[PDB]
Amino acid sequence: PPKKPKKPGXPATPEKLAAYEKELAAYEKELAAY
Numbered sequence: 303p304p305k306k307p308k309k310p311g312x313p314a315t316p317e318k319l320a321a322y323e324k325e326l327a328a329y330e331k332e333l334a335a336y
Contacts, residue, residue: 304332 307325
C-alpha cells in the first residue's frame with residue numbers, strides 16, 4: 303500500500319507545495335490503482 307506523502311511544514315516554498323500536490327495526485331492514482 304502506497305504511503306501518504308507528508309506535508310512540507312515551516313519553510314515551504316511554492317515549488318515544494320506544487321510537488322506536494324503532484325505527489326498527492328500520484329498518491330491518488332496509485333491508491334485508486336491499488
